[PDB]
């Protein structure tokens, strides 16, 4: 899996989130607990 | 009536006859001499076949009592109360016949190379010998106020 | 009736998984069979006020062949021992192992005993060998033929498992170089007039259940 | 709409997975069959038969839940539609069915058999 | 919730074209 | 009635998933609008009162 | 009349005595086992069996109690009450004997390789006998209300 | 009317043996003409000597089908459970006695040239149970038409 | 009206067999083909006699299907459920032992090349038992006839 | 029916079989554990009587269970004692089961290392809720059995 | 009617008890052998066993809720519902404990070695308590369904 | 009658579920193993799981279409066709999957000593894989006379 | 009619629980042994815990969906069409269970030595959704046909 353009899953970036995130406001707790997770990406 | 309780009397000397059976079987198994010879523990090792057996002997009496309570014909008052005295000297029996063996198989294999242990192991089996009196005397105690049924 | 259907499919089903119990692992026998029978034989035997018991009158069918059927089931397996330990000497020896074959015979006799009776136990007729509670009385006749047949088929499949038994022991007799085989087949001997005995005691004790017109 | 109990929520909910994976089933086909680009072939032909079965399936679907007025269905739509589907060519509707109304099982058995 | 991701990896995969489009969606926001 | 004509109003009628994109990630950035649009789309809100029946049984 | 009580006679003694015939054997198992080694635990050893069977006095002091209230008539208010009764101290018994047995094995071995281990056995064996009793005592707070058969 | 099971017991009974007797017989057969060559001819005497038991099973089960289906009652159902028991059981433990007598047989034959022909006397000797389990299930059978 | 049981008893009981004796054929045939990897065609003869017994309980099913109204009595739905646990019995005997004589045969056939012959006529000669339960289930089928 | 006697009968039994096989593996864990250090007979002595405590549940959800019954017996007086009897016997035949293998465990472990005697004993004296839910199950089905007829 | 609706309410509590009970012992089992090898992991070892603990309550509630539905009249239609979701909840209780014995055992057996699997452990075992929070909730909607009729 | 469709429909897709289960797993169990051993033969051996997993197919669409012909009221004519079709599938599926799974464990362990039986397991479990689809054809065509009535 | 019903519902979380607990007990079984040779291969090997215990929301969501569907009043015909999808999802969800335990032990400890079988093991354990998904659809459409007014 070393292609330059395609293929190498473009699609799951999308279809991945979307339909695993159907499966669970519970998101809100996630959204926060993913959100600490971009300032604390650095560190 | 359907005249049910003579297998009462039928079913009291089987368990009492099978642990009597399981106790001398258990008991004459074993190696008993140890190079050409024994201390003479061949007398000693008599004693669980006649324990054994003492549990079929007292077992008999119940089986006797009430088959002679049977008779030829009976209500099902008198059969129902009849019948149940059986199987209480015949667990008795089967559990003091199965103990027995045992321990007599234990006290024979043990008893074999030393005698020392003989003490206990025939103060254990008259010890145990005692529930198919206590049936017996359960079943004669049963069967004594299932006479004269009408 | 329910018990003719019930008996014979509890019959097939019990000699099928006892067939396939001693054979290769694909059948196993129904272990929850016995604690639920004997649950709901205990739970409706006290509950309610009455007394359990199943009332046929003949069923006219299992003597004659329970009897020839077991004594030749019985007699069939006895040889397979015996036979296996004869032949199972080999070249060890050419001793009395190969001239014991009188033992098979023995074996050979349970299927001819309780057979001969199942024979004579069917007079001038097939459905029904005496009377019967369906038109007639005295359906104890044919009542008696099933426990007599059955005991006189028990009492020669026992006989001549024993007798097989004891000519499996007969074939070598001797764990070491010069031994004797006619002390094992002296007791071999004695184990033989069980089912002769047996059926005569069986077949005497039982009466007769033939001449029905 | 809103989860109050059951046999309520479920008759959306259950098409409505359905109803989201034939788009997704539908773009992962039209993905494989725009790729692999004279070299063309195997892809055209496939998803006819699940495009129709799945097509009709959602088009009843669709149709059931704006049927109010009686022309429409209980059990469910739209399963029961599909399921008593490729089994009797000669049928007309079960249940909830357009003014059509057994061409479509005809051209989708005749589709798929192709 | 992994279900997704196995069905979508394993059955998704086959019409589209293994784990390379999971550390393709994470590597396609890096680049 | 149906939430199908406010998704294909919304989506059909807003900007048709189209038509630029960036000049880097055009790929993920051009394609993910498309199914975040869809799914948006098929979440949108096409719940009962039109064959619904509350508090059953 | 009809009755189905009279089992519950025998159904205390023949768990009790089957408790109390396996605790004697596994005492006499222990105590065989552990007398070969040295001879003066013998007789100290030999107290389990003796205190392990008491158990039955209460299976068959209920027993006879349990068959002492039964009348000339049989009703629905003393059948099924001594089957009950009687096997609740027929179980405690063959549990308390189920546990004395392998408490007096292990007592009697681990008593036999170390000293001072029986004060902790005779303590434990001594103390199995709660069930026992409680079994006993509401076998005779069932068998209480056996009688009055209306 | 329960005859049907016990029709089909004698066919399944000695077939269950039959397929026993030749799995055991085949299996030694097999084991022991891995050795010698020539001992194929004389040990494959035991599988076709125990594979000829379903012929009685499957003639009382063609004899008791053919009473079935045109008369039937009460009396006329119960001797074919026996007749296919009698055989069912004799074609059993015929060929499980006839496969581990073929199997010392086999080996006895495959030592030297001397039980070869105790184990065919032997092997041969033994059809005398199913003989009288086919003969007591055709005297049966035979006998099932008294009224009606 | 419940003769579908015996219906599907012997294409249930044959499909065990067959299953049975596919999976003791395959079992052999692997530990056969370890060793030399030339015969490769010449041991597959046993799933294929063991498959082959299939087609008596799929045509005695489906020929038993066709004889299957609205209305039946109570005679005509018992001795089906005999003649398809005949068929049953007698091709799961015969497939438990094509299985047995198909490992044996493979297993006695890796060795030397000349016991192919013995384990070829063991597994030819083993399927007797399931056209034996098979006609006696197609005679028993064909004798049943009842309305109401 | 009258068949209630053998229901409220076996709660005590299953407590007492319990607590019989939680006394015998705590017996065959201080009897192994003593052989090779006389010194911790009286600190592994805990589990026999903490597992002997929970036949009082029993006994005494029998004896409430036999003293609330009355002179008829009936079909509506044998299924709510059975059960509750049944529960308690089952929760402290289970309880007793755990505490066996935990007093052993505590008991066989403790000869090496008597550290773990907080954990065992917490552990040992925290499995003994399954008696008094049971006891609480019993005591709520045998609260609804009254006006027996 | 005959009254026979608690078999439901203690097959629950005997199912979720019995699956405590080894789930209990299974983990005080690997805690008790881990805890003489390491003192360190002693309160890290215990969440096992209030973990496995605490499926008793949800067949005690769903038992104790089902026995306020069962009413002084019972009716014959009125046990089936409790039975199936205290059938239900009894096995999924039994299996939720059977697998939190052996998680947990496995879990101090693994982690008595190397401390790194505790975060996949204390996962892998947190995750098996669904079971009996999806039996109780479905013995709660059963149970909620069974106090209309009658 | 009430119903006995169900008992056909449930035991057919339970059987073919639960034989293509046990054949996944004995495939998946050797295939797993075998996997350390030969990283090349992972994809050769990974045939039997997914050639194994396919057997539920014919269940499930027999289960479906005799599902499709049971609405809320049905007769009884349809209850002993759809119990022996569904009988008949369920066997066929078990056996199917019971003889692919030991023959799929025992290529997938011996195809790593040498690789050139795999045409012969693959030919094994494509001709041990039609005894599922005989029964499911007995099944589609007894199932086929179960949708006149209802 | 005697509304009986709750037997089928409540049947399928038995097995799908006990099948999910073997299969998490399994898979957690090997995870704490194969976590200790490699700490980066805890997280790949806990996916087998979630992937068994997965197949417990096919059950609990036909439960809690025929639990609904009782209600007070119920037919004869009603009852019977839900114990084939309950006792076909519980046994095919026990079976897909119990061999995921095996496969998912084999596969964590084929799978602990050599990193690179990871994606044959998750490949070979992804396919076994087809049986309970299968499972559940059959049991979703026989519990849709059970309900047909109201």
């Given at each position: 899996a070393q292609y330059r353009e395609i293929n190498a899953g473009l699609?799951?970036?999308?279809?991945?989130?979307?339909?695993?995130?159907?499966?669970?406001?519970?998101?809100?707790?996630?959204?926060?607990?993913?959100?600490?997770?971009?300032?604390?990406?650095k560190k | 009536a359907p005249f049910f309780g003579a297998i009462g009397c039928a079913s009291a000397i089987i368990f009492t006859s099978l642990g009597a059976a399981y106790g001398t079987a258990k008991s004459g198994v074993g190696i008993c001499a140890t190079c050409v010879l024994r201390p003479d523990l061949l007398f000693k090792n008599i004693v669980p076949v006649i324990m054994a057996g003492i549990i079929a002997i007292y077992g008999l009496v119940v089986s006797v009592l009430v088959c002679y309570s049977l008779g030829q014909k009976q209500?099902?008052?008198?059969?129902?109360?009849?019948?149940?005295?059986?199987?209480?000297?015949?667990?008795?029996?089967?559990?003091?016949?199965?103990?027995?063996?045992?321990?007599?198989?234990?006290?024979?294999?043990?008893?074999?190379?030393?005698?020392?242990?003989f003490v206990g192991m025939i103060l254990i089996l008259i010890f145990a010998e005692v529930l198919g009196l206590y049936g017996l005397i359960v079943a004669l105690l049963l069967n004594s106020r299932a006479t004269q049924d009408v | 009736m329910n018990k003719e259907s019930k008996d014979d499919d509890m019959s097939l089903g019990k000699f099928s998984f006892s067939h396939f119990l001693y054979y290769l692992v694909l059948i196993v026998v129904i272990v929850y069979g016995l604690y639920k029978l004997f649950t709901g034989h205990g739970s409706d035997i006290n509950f309610g006020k009455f007394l359990l018991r199943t009332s046929p009158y003949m069923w006219a069918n299992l003597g004659i062949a329970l009897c020839v059927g077991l004594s030749v089931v019985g007699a069939a397996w006895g040889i397979f021992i015996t036979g296996s330990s004869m032949?199972?000497?080999?070249?060890?020896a050419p001793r009395i192992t190969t001239?014991?074959?009188?033992?098979?015979?023995?074996?050979?006799?349970?299927?001819?005993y309780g057979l001969i009776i199942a024979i004579v136990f069917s007079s001038k007729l097939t459905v029904a060998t005496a009377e019967n509670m369906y038109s007639k009385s005295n359906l104890y006749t044919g009542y008696s033929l099933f426990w007599a047949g059955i005991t006189v088929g028990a009492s020669n499949?026992?006989?001549?498992?024993?007798?097989?038994?004891?000519?499996?022991?007969?074939?070598?007799?001797?764990?070491?170089?010069?031994?004797?085989?006619?002390?094992?087949?002296?007791?071999?001997?004695?184990?033989?007039?069980?089912?002769?005995?047996?059926?005569?005691?069986?077949?005497?004790?039982?009466?007769?259940?033939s001449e029905f017109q | 709409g809103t989860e109050n109990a059951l046999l309520f929520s479920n008759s959306y909910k259950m098409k409505l997975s359905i109803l989201m994976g034939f788009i997704h089933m539908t773009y992962s086909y039209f993905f494989s069959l725009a790729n692999h680009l004279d070299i063309i072939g195997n892809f055209i032909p496939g998803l006819l038969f699940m495009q129709g079965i799945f097509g009709y399936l959602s088009?009843?679907?669709?149709?059931?839940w704006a049927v109010d007025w009686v022309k429409d269905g209980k059990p469910a739509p739209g399963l029961l539609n599909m399921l008593i589907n490729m089994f009797l060519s000669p049928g007309t509707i079960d249940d909830?069915?357009?003014?059509?109304?057994?061409?479509?099982?005809?051209?989708?058995?005749?589709?798929?058999?192709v | 919730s992994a279900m997704l991701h196995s069905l979508r990896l394993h059955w998704v995969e086959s019409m589209s074209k293994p784990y390379e489009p999971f550390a393709f969606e994470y590597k396609d926001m890096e680049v | 009635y149906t939430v199908v004509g406010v998704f294909i109003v919304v989506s059909a009628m807003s900007?048709?998933?189209?038509?630029?994109?960036?000049?880097?990630?055009?790929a993920v950035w051009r394609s993910t609008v498309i199914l975040t649009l869809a799914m948006m789309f098929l979440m949108w809100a096409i719940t009962f009162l039109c064959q619904l029946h509350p508090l059953v049984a």
């Open positions: 699609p799951t970036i999308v279809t991945f989130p979307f339909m695993f995130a159907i499966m669970f406001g519970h998101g809100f707790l996630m959204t926060l607990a993913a959100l600490s997770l971009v300032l604390n990406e | 209500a099902l008052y008198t059969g129902f109360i009849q019948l149940g005295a059986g199987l209480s000297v015949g667990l008795s029996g089967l559990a003091a016949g199965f103990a027995i063996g045992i321990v007599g198989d234990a006290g024979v294999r043990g008893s074999s190379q030393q005698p020392r242990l | 032949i199972g000497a080999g070249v060890r001239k014991n074959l009188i033992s098979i015979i023995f074996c050979e006799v349970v299927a001819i499949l026992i006989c001549g498992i024993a007798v097989g038994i004891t000519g499996a022991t007969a074939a070598i007799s001797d764990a070491a170089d010069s031994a004797l085989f006619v002390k094992i087949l002296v007791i071999e001997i004695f184990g033989s007039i069980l089912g002769l005995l047996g059926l005569i005691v069986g077949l005497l004790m039982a009466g007769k259940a | 088009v009843c679907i669709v149709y059931k909830e069915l357009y003014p059509h109304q057994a061409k479509v099982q005809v051209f989708l058995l005749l589709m798929a058999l | - | 900007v048709l998933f189209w038509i630029m994109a960036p000049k880097n990630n055009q």
